[PDB]
Amino acid sequence: QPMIYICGECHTENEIKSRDPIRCRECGYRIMYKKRTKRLVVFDAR
Amino acid sequence: MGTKANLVTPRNGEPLIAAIQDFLTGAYLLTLKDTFFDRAKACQIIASILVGKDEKIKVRLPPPTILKPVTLWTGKQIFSVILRPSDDNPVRANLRTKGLCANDSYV
Amino acid sequence: MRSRVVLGEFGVRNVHTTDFPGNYSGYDDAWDQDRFEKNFRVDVVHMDENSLEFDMVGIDAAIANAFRRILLAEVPTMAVEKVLVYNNTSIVQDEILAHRLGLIPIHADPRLFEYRNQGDEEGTEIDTLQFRLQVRCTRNPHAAKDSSDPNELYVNHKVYTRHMTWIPLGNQADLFPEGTIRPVHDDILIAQLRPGQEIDLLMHCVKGIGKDHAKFSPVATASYRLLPDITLLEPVEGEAAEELSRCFSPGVIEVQEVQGKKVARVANPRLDTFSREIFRNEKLKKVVRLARVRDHYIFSVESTGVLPPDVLVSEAIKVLMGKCRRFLD
Amino acid sequence: KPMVKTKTIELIEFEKLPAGQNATVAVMSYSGYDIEDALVLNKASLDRGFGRCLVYKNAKCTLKRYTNQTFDKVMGPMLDAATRKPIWRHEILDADGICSPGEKVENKQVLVNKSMPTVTQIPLEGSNVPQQPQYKDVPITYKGATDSYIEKVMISSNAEDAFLIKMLLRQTRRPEIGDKFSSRHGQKGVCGLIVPQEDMPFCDSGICPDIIMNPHGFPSRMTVGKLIELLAGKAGVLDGRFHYGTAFGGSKVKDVCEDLVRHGYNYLGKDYVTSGITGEPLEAYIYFGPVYYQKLKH
Amino acid sequence: MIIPVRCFTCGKIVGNKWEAYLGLLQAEYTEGDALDALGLKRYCCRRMLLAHVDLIEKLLNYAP
Amino acid sequence: GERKTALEMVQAAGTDRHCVTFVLHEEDHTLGNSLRYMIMKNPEVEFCGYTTTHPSESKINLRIQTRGTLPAVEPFQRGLNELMNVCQHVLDKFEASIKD
């Protein structure tokens, strides 16, 4: 249900679930970079 | 093997513990006949015998070893400073020549 | 002798401030005000926007270095200590950007806040000047002049410290934020951005002291000179003036006459950052004598925008008051 | 960039990609920690960013496939109990248990898990029931005693669906007492102390060291290729130049000395420092100028 | 990768001074004199600009 | 208010107040040597003695050691009050010079 699948070769998102290997829309491009998330990570600024 | 192992070896008969480096030259420079100090330079004294754990007795303030127009503390008995459990010692034959030859030997 | 330092070709003599009662058989000043508030004075030099300079006259080294060390990192100022994260899409990230921002000087007076004990957001009541940073970059949409500079195809291709919009906590809204809340500099390259990236943050501007993490220093130039007083002995009047005006720094020694040969003695013996070639003419060095004097510990403080340097030096000299009388009961 | 460079540093092209910070430096003996090639590196320059690190590492969740039974569909923790949704087992993964691009995953949390049914069905006519209720889950968790930050997540899958999970576990371990330095002269000291800004000596202008060496690595190693690099640093910046000392050529000591003269220093580039600790001039002058300290691994 | 906002051993602020040299290297002073019209009168910040490699541009050339 | 700071240490006090090591907590060279200065500047003290013994600079064991008769609280406070007067008179002469 999420869309966390960017492709450094197809700037578009699928998250086609399991038993569908990777293929970025219309291509192989099996090089998914996965999006970051929305938690308010805290950094000591030192 | 904590207090007798360190300083005395049977393989050589020579100490292993020693001023590795700059302690050698820092202490040397102290000993140099030039260096004249201040009673205000009782500061550096006090990391030694007025100092960290297990040394805070007094120190007998080696006397004012000049009384000129300008009182001053020579550099040696600023090295030779401790004032708990008085002791006695002797030495000689440092690394220099012989004869009062700008003396850096027979301490 | 007694506060005339000497600068031999090999090493500096006369340097310990050897005037304490009972360390000189002249007389030593059981020291305070009457002999000390008469000799003391604070000249001023050039005063200006972020750089200040002045010449205290009559201190000795300990209190002067106490100032120096307090101005550097024993005086508090407003600077970020934490960075909340919202959609940090950008390039290198999360600890440099965190610390980049950690290094940006915010411009709120550090005398209308207090320290921060463990509170709600670690604390959210008085201290948290909270800064919002919402920078978006995209494609400048009218660039028929295709394949041009980044400055012309992008939009806010960089993240300057002018996008640091301030967020109000109902506490502050009426006292400071009329315009005296922005960071000092509206131009700092925090992180370049290329189409499709954004940044969004929250910037917890805690109090702090310089010892903690020196990003709390207000000052840059807290280190100084004594003051040189370069002498002359039966001078080298004539054409030697060329030598004793290129050895010393370019304004230091005048060159006045030729008939009245007059290698023109000292003109400005404070402009010389001691290049000291003069021991290598080998025929002059035995005329000049170099002497930085122990009275005038010439200061020159410069800030980082957080406060005017006068405010910083006054704050330091009063924090020494605080320290000295916090152990005096 | 290097700042006393060699005509062969350019030809490599790897002076567009320099490997070490370019550090202000004194030659100074602080107090018994410097001694056998050790370095009193001041803080307030570690603080201002002298010598970060960005140690990455790599976890590869080689998500196999098997002939009869299948890893194929079986991805996804997130039991989602009450405490840490569910627990420091599966606290920080994600909706799909795979990724977490930016969260300080800590000390043996889960970076990725997978129920691991590999051969729980016997390939022959064995047990019938193991049609994937027999997962002995095999977590992929490990880490060291500090927070990483998952920075990239990769589903890199070759033509066989043998799912990798490549991951950028970045750990910005900025220096501390013990870290490794080199010098460009086989002079590999270590951070003895880490002094604060206010205690380091300041010349007269306002410059206080980043690094400190003590002049005890030289006279018995005889790297005199370092008492000179600090001449063509401080003469190349004080003038804007960008100097060369190249093998069997270079730039001699005389022109550099005259450059230091022109912008106000010694022939020898030996500054006239006062001491922070007490506040009055060092008795013997103090070498300075830029070095190029590399920051090693290990 | 990016410009140190502070001269690691000085204190002075720096990051404000890289989009002036790329406009003062084309008024075409000598680098040693593009870094005198902006304030840097010490070792430190002269290092922190003369020595730095703006990998920002070349890296961002292919960021996505 | 110096209850958890000035941990004096006369235990085997040769003179009644001899080994008087004000272990000034949370302290650096800054006050340390300025105090050390003013203390050392009285013709009844023999050590100003300031030496931070720890690696971390928080406990400056100023080991003032007077000439035997006095306590050492008396100089300690003379010096602290003298530094009070000195720094306040410095500020008085200073901020009235910003009008230049």
From Swiss-Prot, chain A:
Zn(2+) binds at C7, C10, C24, C27. It is found in: Nucleus; Nucleus, Nucleolus. Keywords: DNA-directed RNA polymerase, Metal-binding, Nucleus, Transcription, Zinc, Zinc-finger. A zinc finger (C4-type) spans 7-27. GO terms for molecular function: DNA binding; DNA-directed RNA polymerase activity; zinc ion binding. GO terms for cellular component: cytosol; nucleoplasm; nucleus; RNA polymerase I complex; RNA polymerase II, core complex; RNA polymerase III complex. One of its GO terms (biological process) is transcription by RNA polymerase III. Its main location: nucleus. Signal peptide: none annotated. Component of the RNA polymerase I (Pol I), RNA polymerase II (Pol II) and RNA polymerase III (Pol III) complexes consisting of at least 13, 12 and 17 subunits, respectively. Pol I complex consists of a ten-subunit catalytic core composed of POLR1A/RPA1, POLR1B/RPA2, POLR1C/RPAC1, POLR1D/RPAC2, POLR1H/RPA12, POLR2E/RPABC1, POLR2F/RPABC2, POLR2H/RPABC3, POLR2K/RPABC4 and POLR2L/RPABC5; a mobile stalk subunit POLR1F/RPA43 protruding from the core and additional subunits homologous to general transcription factors POLR1E/RPA49 and POLR1G/RPA34. Belongs to the archaeal Rpo12/eukaryotic RPC10 RNA polymerase subunit family. This is DNA-directed RNA polymerases I, II, and III subunit RPABC4. It comes from Homo sapiens. The gene is POLR2K.
From Swiss-Prot, chain D:
One of its GO terms (biological process) is snRNA transcription by RNA polymerase III. It is found in: Nucleus; Cytoplasm, Cytosol. Its main location: nucleus. RNA binds at K180, K188. GO terms for molecular function: DNA binding; DNA-directed RNA polymerase activity; DNA/RNA hybrid binding; ribonucleoside binding; zinc ion binding. GO terms for cellular component: cytoplasm; cytosol; mitochondrion; nucleoplasm; RNA polymerase III complex. It comes from the Eukaryota. Keywords: Antiviral defense, Charcot-Marie-Tooth disease, Cytoplasm, Disease variant, DNA-directed RNA polymerase, Immunity, Innate immunity, Leukodystrophy, Magnesium, Metal-binding, Neurodegeneration, Neuropathy, Nucleotidyltransferase, Nucleus, Transcription, Transferase, Zinc, Zinc-finger. Belongs to the RNA polymerase beta chain family. It is linked to Leukodystrophy, hypomyelinating, 8, with or without oligodontia and/or hypogonadotropic hypogonadism: An autosomal recessive neurodegenerative disorder characterized by early childhood onset of cerebellar ataxia and mild intellectual disabilities associated with diffuse hypomyelination apparent on brain MRI. Variable features include oligodontia and/or hypogonadotropic hypogonadism. This is DNA-directed RNA polymerase III subunit RPC2. It comes from Homo sapiens (Human).
Curated annotation (Swiss-Prot), chain E:
Zn(2+) binds at C7, C10, C44, C45. GO terms for biological process: regulation of transcription by RNA polymerase I; transcription by RNA polymerase I; transcription by RNA polymerase II; tRNA transcription by RNA polymerase III. The keyword Zinc applies. It is found in: Nucleus; Nucleus, Nucleolus. Its main location: nucleus. SUPFAM superfamilies: RNA polymerase subunit RPB10 (SSF46924). Pfam families: RNA_pol_N. GO terms for molecular function: DNA binding; DNA-directed RNA polymerase activity; zinc ion binding. InterPro entries: RNA_pol_su_RPB10, RNA_pol_suN_Zn-BS, RPABC5/Rpb10. It comes from the Eukaryota. GO terms for cellular component: cytosol; nucleoplasm; nucleus; RNA polymerase I complex; RNA polymerase II, core complex; RNA polymerase III complex. Keywords: DNA-directed RNA polymerase, Metal-binding, Nucleus, Transcription, Zinc. Signal peptide: none annotated. Belongs to the archaeal Rpo10/eukaryotic RPB10 RNA polymerase subunit family. Component of the RNA polymerase I (Pol I), RNA polymerase II (Pol II) and RNA polymerase III (Pol III) complexes consisting of at least 13, 12 and 17 subunits, respectively. Pol I complex consists of a ten-subunit catalytic core composed of POLR1A/RPA1, POLR1B/RPA2, POLR1C/RPAC1, POLR1D/RPAC2, POLR1H/RPA12, POLR2E/RPABC1, POLR2F/RPABC2, POLR2H/RPABC3, POLR2K/RPABC4 and POLR2L/RPABC5; a mobile stalk subunit POLR1F/RPA43 protruding from the core and additional subunits homologous to general transcription factors POLR1E/RPA49 and POLR1G/RPA34. It comes from Homo sapiens (Human). The gene is POLR2L.
UniProtKB/Swiss-Prot annotation, chain F:
It is linked to Treacher Collins syndrome 2: A form of Treacher Collins syndrome, a disorder of craniofacial development. Treacher Collins syndrome is characterized by a combination of bilateral downward slanting of the palpebral fissures, colobomas of the lower eyelids with a paucity of eyelashes medial to the defect, hypoplasia of the facial bones, cleft palate, malformation of the external ears, atresia of the external auditory canals, and bilateral conductive hearing loss. This is DNA-directed RNA polymerases I and III subunit RPAC2. The keyword Nucleus applies. It is found in: Nucleus; Nucleus, Nucleolus. Keywords: Acetylation, Disease variant, DNA-directed RNA polymerase, Nucleus, Transcription. The lineage of its organism: Eukaryota, Metazoa, Chordata, Craniata, Vertebrata. One of its GO terms (molecular function) is protein dimerization activity. DNA-dependent RNA polymerase catalyzes the transcription of DNA into RNA using the four ribonucleoside triphosphates as substrates. Common component of RNA polymerases I and III which synthesize ribosomal RNA precursors and short non-coding RNAs including 5S rRNA, snRNAs, tRNAs and miRNAs, respectively. Its main location: nucleus. GO terms for biological process: transcription by RNA polymerase III; transcription elongation by RNA polymerase I. Belongs to the archaeal Rpo11/eukaryotic RPB11/RPC19 RNA polymerase subunit family. GO terms for cellular component: RNA polymerase I complex; RNA polymerase III complex. The keyword Acetylation applies.
